[PDB]
Paper text:
IadA is a binuclear metalloenzyme and a member of the amidohydrolase superfamily. This enzyme catalyzes the hydrolytic cleavage of β-aspartyl dipeptides. In the present study, we determined the crystal structures of IadA from Colwellia psychrerythraea strain 34H (CpsIadA) in its ligand-free form and that in complex with β-isoaspartyl lysine, and subsequently characterized its enzymatic properties. The CpsIadA monomer structure contains ten α-helices and eighteen β-strands, and the overall structure is divided into two distinct domains (a β-sandwich domain and a catalytic domain).
The E80Q mutant had no catalytic activity toward β-Asp-Leu, but its CD spectra and denaturation temperature (Tm) were similar to WT, indicating that this mutation affected catalytic activity but not the overall folding and integrity of CpsIadA. A structural comparison between the ligand-free wild type CpsIadA structure and the structure of the CpsIadA E80Q mutant complexed with β-isoaspartyl lysine show several structural changes occur upon ligand binding. Notably, upon substrate binding, a slight tilt of residue Tyr140 is observed with a 61° rotation. Tyr140 interacts with the O04 and O07 atoms of the bound β-isoaspartyl lysine. The bound β-isoaspartyl lysine, with the exception of the lysine side-chain region, forms tight interactions with CpsIadA. In detail, the O07 atom of the bound β-isoaspartyl lysine interacts with the ZN1 metal ion. The OG1 atom of Thr109 and the OE1 atom of Glu80 interact with the N11 atom of the β-isoaspartyl lysine, and the SG atom of Cys297 interacts with the O13 atom of β-isoaspartyl lysine. Residues Arg173 and Arg237 interact with the O01 and O04 atoms of the β-isoaspartyl lysine. The lysine side chain of β-isoaspartyl lysine did not have any specific interactions with CpsIadA. Thus, this region has a relatively weak electron density. These results suggest that the side chain of the second amino acid in β-the isoaspartyl substrate is not critical for ligand recognition and specificity.
Author numbering:
A (entry chain A), B (entry chain B): 6 to 300, 310 to 395
Write the structure that this text describes.
Amino acid sequence: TMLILLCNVNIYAPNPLGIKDVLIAGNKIAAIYDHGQGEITIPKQWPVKVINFDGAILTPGFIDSHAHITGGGGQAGFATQVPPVGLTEFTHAGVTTVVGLLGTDDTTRSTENLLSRVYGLREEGLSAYCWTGGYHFPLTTITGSAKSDIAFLEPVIGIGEFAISDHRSSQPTFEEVIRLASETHVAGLITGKAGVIHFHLGDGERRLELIERAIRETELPARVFNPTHVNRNKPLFEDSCKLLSKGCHIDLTAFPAGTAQPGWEACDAIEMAVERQLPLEQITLSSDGGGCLPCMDFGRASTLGETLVATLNKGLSLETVLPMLTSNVANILRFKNKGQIAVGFDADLLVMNEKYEITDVMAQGVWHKQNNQTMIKGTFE
Amino acid sequence: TMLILLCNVNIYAPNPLGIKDVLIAGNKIAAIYDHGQGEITIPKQWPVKVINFDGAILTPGFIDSHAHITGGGGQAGFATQVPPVGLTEFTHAGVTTVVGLLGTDDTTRSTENLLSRVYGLREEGLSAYCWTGGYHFPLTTITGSAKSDIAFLEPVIGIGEFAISDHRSSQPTFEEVIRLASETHVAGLITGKAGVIHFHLGDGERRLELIERAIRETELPARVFNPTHVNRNKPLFEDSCKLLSKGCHIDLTAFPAGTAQPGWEACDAIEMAVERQLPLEQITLSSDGGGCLPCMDFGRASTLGETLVATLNKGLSLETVLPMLTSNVANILRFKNKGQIAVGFDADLLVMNEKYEITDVMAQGVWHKQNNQTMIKGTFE
Ligand SMILES: [Zn+2]
Ligand SMILES: [Zn+2]
Ligand SMILES: [Zn+2]
Ligand SMILES: [Zn+2]
């Protein structure tokens, strides 16, 4: 029903708030206040559903900035094209907002395909956005330019998974890179949208030279450049840590456990960042859901949960790591109503048990999972 | 604030519900129930503005399907280009949703201009959509076709205002017209949007020939063809009335003052339709706000309210005419959450005094005018 009162929840906003009651009205968070020792009087004509959670952890929904919502793959033949990722693979992993992109195969797939799937997910009740462009240069777009795509297509927030330091890249020059960045950046001012360029990094030894040079040589703000897969190898991760002091957000990939290659598992990279006193608000985590992870090995949204369990199991506190999946991502992507359990924000939230497994998932004030039961399924699941 | 309680309100939903209290949650209507007297016990922890309206009339907000949000004109030289229409021109006149369009000048003005203004008005708190094309063939678009415009640009709902039977038209062929109709119609299927073509009618003796012919010879549903300015002359009005038996929605223009010229004032046309027992659900009214009205007059949204008052002073009932500004528009344009005062619909509401003047205006749950005072101005008003 439209009003939902969630009683007795231990809120991580991601900041710890202690035990609270939270009123949801429509798709928004309407109130948060201390859990009174008795009950309240609710006027009878108002339809309100009341649920007592007996102190269970309450969290913002995860914001996954890197999902191949159309499916990725296609890098070892046509038969390796991954089908579309279903609604429940996001929601049951706790992802209430997704940002889709094309990757390596931006030749058989189009931005048309990508944006249609975005709207699909929106009709099914998920919050969804996307990146235009892909790995390659010139860019795959709808209207012919990144600038026009970001200006005129509401869900498109930036340029994404644009490849550098990778054998599958377009070997882009510095001039090409800073022109692209100038286009997302200015379109972001025009629209109020992220206006970032989300870089795919591979294993090339030039690492982040292009980004380091752009920031040094140019007036482009550091935040415009958002590299991902930064834990994929060790030298890269070191450079990415250094990159933090310029102002860049950096994005770890939650690789399926024991597949982090010769780089760092995301949980180890997080622990290292904490030990080292790095600015944790500039670090994010994404799943690479629907992507292939080449030597075939498939990305899925549930690795966010597992990375989080693995960090907690090391003795890191929930408040230290949770912003990496929530408020840190909302910050760089300019999702002003997401990523926080606070009055006026969207009612995107998760409930977890003592083991940190996600039992309940609400998106836009509507339950997609409840008491560990799927409430909402996608059209063809 | 997040919850607002409207007490003692005489609801026309548009259909008369009598005296109610109405609870607003965020941007939605959440409860409607019998007023009664006595307590109302609201929890102290829940922020709720309570407002008493002493029995005053409450209606849905007006939906204006035909507004030059960028300005129209340009038909008697370059100095006659109307400037953009400020937010309050819509809200002070009770328009909570607008559908913008290009007119005669789709040469120096672009869909990019139009769409940018849609997004402008959304940022200021109005609900706004638009038609792509404009008078002329080939169409003025962003992407290169209406099909892909309607499919990929969320606020674009169809094609309009496409000219037939006018000296300023492109003299389109029947083949040209039904091809455009197939385009919006199919895009309406793909997207769930209106999928209509909104035609400008001129004073040509051929009138609605091309639409009559499309409906008779093709499989295209009648609702796809949506002529406006049907009251501009008397033969055209007779023919448009006949067209209602085919299933089409027809659109009256609220010409100002005594400017209906050789046709009918919208108030008379409406009276005639009620006397003739035509299907009134298929009749709408739009302002042409920001347009030029050459033989030269100016459209403005406040003609809507005037036409309403003029029709009630004829002895017509509010519930008979009100749907023509609200629910009948929402129906043809497939604005499933607009046009009605009902639980689950968007909180777009007007309050009127006994003289049918609009004293309050709410758009998406936010007050733009309260107690005869302007609460929100456009960025440059
Ligand atoms: Zn990648
Ligand atoms: Zn990827
Ligand atoms: Zn016209
Ligand atoms: Zn017009």
